[PDB]
Design a binder for this molecule. Structure first.
Ligand code: FAD
Ligand code: FMN
Ligand code: 2AM
Length: 610
């Protein structure tokens, strides 16, 4: 519970703003859109601002009508089980319990979601419906951006109709030109001590480690083990062990660990080199809006090298607004036109953006090379690029067995992009290079989750996790094996695992063998998808054991667990539908419902990513 800021409406009256855009973001996307809509206001004769709903008290909404033509927009993303982002929790809870009258309040909502999840854009739908219930009036249709297809285009399309509608309603009109959020200040005699070198929180935070640790103050865990898990060479699957000794950090199997990686130093040098810039200049980007709490786009003062290395996203396909602001720096007319046309909501521009940038997975350097006429000043490129995000990983260990260590199970990302070059995953390439024992350190923190073992050690457990999904279950199994070692009475523990071949990527083959032999694993059912002509998937095994699984489900009150990358989860879900439908019996419909009831009742947990 942080100390809230004073009334945002009052802050709006002072700074002469009529529109405010809050963001429910966790990975930074929502925030990105919020900031974009906020600036937009200016091109329509209005002034706006974006804000973190956590730092404010949304009850002040009822005072928004005090401002003429005032308007409020919410860019909210959803997380696991249609839940709000951590930073939208206060607002969510408030909407639930409040009875405040929002008469005269004009609002609009854009939801960031992903059609593959159960509760698609639940947060958005809820905010949009709740505000109308409290008596506020919708000024524009609810937006349903789908990250499965292309969220960016969903935002453009929505946005392209949003502003005209706002103008129409408030009787305003168009006016643009390039505007910078920050101002460059080159520091010359800057004492080193006052220069950020990659820390996230306070100056020298990574060196002077003082608890508690978290996203703002990550703990640098030393890598004590980094081994290759797969036997073959098709891909690289590694096992890392981070030592959290004296971190006073607690965790449970099923939780996630987040890490702050470093971009590929050569990729960084090249961006600098090709821009003809000196990545070693010490500078600061100071907000030209002396009112905003966001003093800088990222920790300052610091160097461009450090910025591009630890604070900036330099590998993900740039969004239309970035390519739009950059077109101004392409001396070649044709290249300026393409970059400029990227933000179209249809036609050749949209197509070009979709295939040549997105489908092509062209990162910022690639575009600079494939458009040699584009040479933006380094300082402006840093204001435009998004913030490098922490990457999450399901802890592959139990604290009951490994309280001072956090395990990670991951497959290094490296692929051939249609863009012509070989793209490398940021966090994984970085993790792969971490050699134990010059102490390989990894800035990280733990995030609690709702993917947990059952409370009663007797409850049956069904773990479905193909490929790397086997990650959280390695901790589950250790812990369960541990419960049997501690004389506790443990119910059946079944693992439904999958890989291509037992001689290629059969993860933890030995360990898993140990547990089965010692009885920790009641069943070790493994589906090798490529050892025969047809695919043998984990769900094929669930179908095979329908009779038994049903007995554990319907009578043993067993808990179902699904992990993996993200199509797979759906298949597994339908298999459970058909299992229940045949053994109930019952229609497909009452089956889907049965399995759905199990999810709400906490007996079917999901942990799928990307
Ligand atoms: C909750 C949660 C738990 C997770 N748990 C784990 C885990 O336990 N183990 C694990 O291995 N991962 C896990 N992840 C995934 C992890 O967070 C990262 O997404 C993954 O490690 C890749 O990150 P990176 O920085 O290495 O690569 P990035 O730089 O993040 O690149 C990732 C992007 O590469 C692109 N890409 C990948 N392959 C291709 C391709 N061949 N063609 C075109 N584009 C492609 C995709 O857009 C993908 O999003 C989890 C994710 C979440 C959210
Ligand atoms: C762990 C996790 C859980 C998610 N759960 C949901 C969900 O329940 N419903 C949904 O529509 N989208 C879900 N998504 C997708 C996000 O809503 C979507 O990627 C959004 O663009 C993220 O925005 P942000 O970067 O601003 O947080 C999830 C993503 C992750 C990583
Ligand atoms: N739809 C699906 N359902 C269950 N497993 C799947 C799946 N699609 C792929 N897999 C398997 O997930 C495992 C880890 O990536 C691999 O064995 C992969 O098999 P495949 O690669 O031969 O299709």
């Amino acid at each position: 519970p942080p100390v809230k800021e004073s009334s945002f409406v009052e802050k709006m009256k002072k700074t002469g703003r009529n529109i405010i855009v809050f963001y429910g973001s966790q990975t930074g996307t929502a925030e990105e859109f919020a900031n974009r809509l906020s600036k937009d206001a200016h091109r329509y004769g209005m002034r706006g601002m974006s804000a973190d709903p956590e730092e404010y008290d949304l009850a002040d909404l009822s005072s928004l009508p005090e401002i003429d033509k005032s308007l409020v927009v919410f860019c909210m993303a959803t997380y696991g089980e249609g839940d709000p982002t951590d930073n939208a929790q206060d607002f969510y809870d408030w909407l639930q319990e409040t009875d405040v009258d929002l008469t005269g309040v004009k609002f609009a909502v854009f939801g960031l979601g992903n059609k593959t999840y159960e509760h698609f854009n639940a947060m958005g739908k809820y905010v949009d419906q709740r505000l109308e219930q409290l008596g506020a009036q919708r000024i524009f249709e609810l937006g349903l951006g789908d990250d499965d297809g292309n969220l960016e285009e969903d935002f453009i399309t929505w946005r392209e109709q949003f502003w005209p509608a706002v103008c129409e309603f408030f009787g305003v009109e168009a006016t643009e030109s390039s505007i910078r959020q920050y101002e460059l200040v080159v520091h010359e005699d800057m004492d080193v001590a006052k220069v950020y070198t990659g820390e996230m929180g306070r100056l020298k935070s990574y060196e002077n480690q003082k608890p508690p640790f978290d996203a703002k103050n990550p703990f640098l865990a030393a890598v004590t083990a980094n081994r290759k898990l797969n036997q073959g060479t098709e891909r690289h699957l590694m096992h890392l062990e981070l030592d959290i000794s004296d971190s006073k950090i607690r965790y449970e199997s099923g939780d996630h660990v987040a890490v702050y990686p470093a971009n590929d130093s050569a990729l960084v040098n090249q961006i600098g080199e090709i821009l003809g810039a000196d990545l070693d200049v010490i500078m600061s980007l100071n907000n030209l809006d002396e009112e905003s709490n966001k003093k800088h786009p990222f920790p300052c003062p610091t160097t461009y090298r450090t910025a591009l290395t630890y604070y900036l996203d330099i590998t993900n396909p740039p969004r239309t607004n970035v390519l739009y602001e950059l077109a101004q720096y392409a001396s070649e007319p044709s290249e300026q036109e393409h970059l400029h046309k990227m933000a179209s909501s249809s036609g050749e521009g949209k197509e070009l953006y979709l295939s040549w940038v997105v489908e092509a997975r062209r990162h910022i350097l690639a575009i600079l090379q494939d458009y040699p006429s584009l040479r933006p000043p380094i300082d402006h490129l840093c204001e435009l690029l998004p913030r490098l995000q922490a990457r999450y990983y399901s802890i592959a260990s139990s604290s009951k067995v490994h309280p001072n260590s956090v395990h990670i199970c991951a497959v290094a990302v490296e692929y051939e992009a249609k863009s012509g070059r070989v793209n490398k995953g940021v966090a994984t390439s970085w993790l792969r290079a971490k050699e134990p024992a010059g102490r390989a350190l990894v800035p990280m923190f733990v995030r609690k989750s709702q993917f947990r073992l059952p409370f009663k050690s007797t409850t049956p457990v069904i773990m479905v996790g193909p490929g790397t999904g086997i990650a959280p279950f390695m901790g589950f199994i250790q812990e369960r094996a541990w419960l049997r070692e501690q004389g506790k009475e443990v119910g059946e523990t079944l693992l439904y695992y999958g890989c291509r071949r037992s001689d290629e990527d059969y993860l933890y083959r030995e360990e898993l063998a140990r547990f089965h032999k010692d009885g920790a694993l009641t069943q070790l059912n493994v589906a090798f998808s490529r050892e025969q002509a047809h695919k043998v998937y984990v769900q094929h095994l669930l179908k095979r054991d329908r009779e038994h699984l049903w007995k554990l489900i319907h009578e043993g009150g067993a808990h179902i667990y699904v992990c993996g990358a993200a199509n797979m989860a759906k298949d597994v879900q339908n298999t459970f539908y058909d299992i229940v439908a045949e053994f109930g019996p019952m229609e497909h419909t009452q089956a889907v419902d049965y399995v759905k009831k199990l999810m709400t009742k906490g007996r079917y947990s999901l942990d799928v990513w990307s």
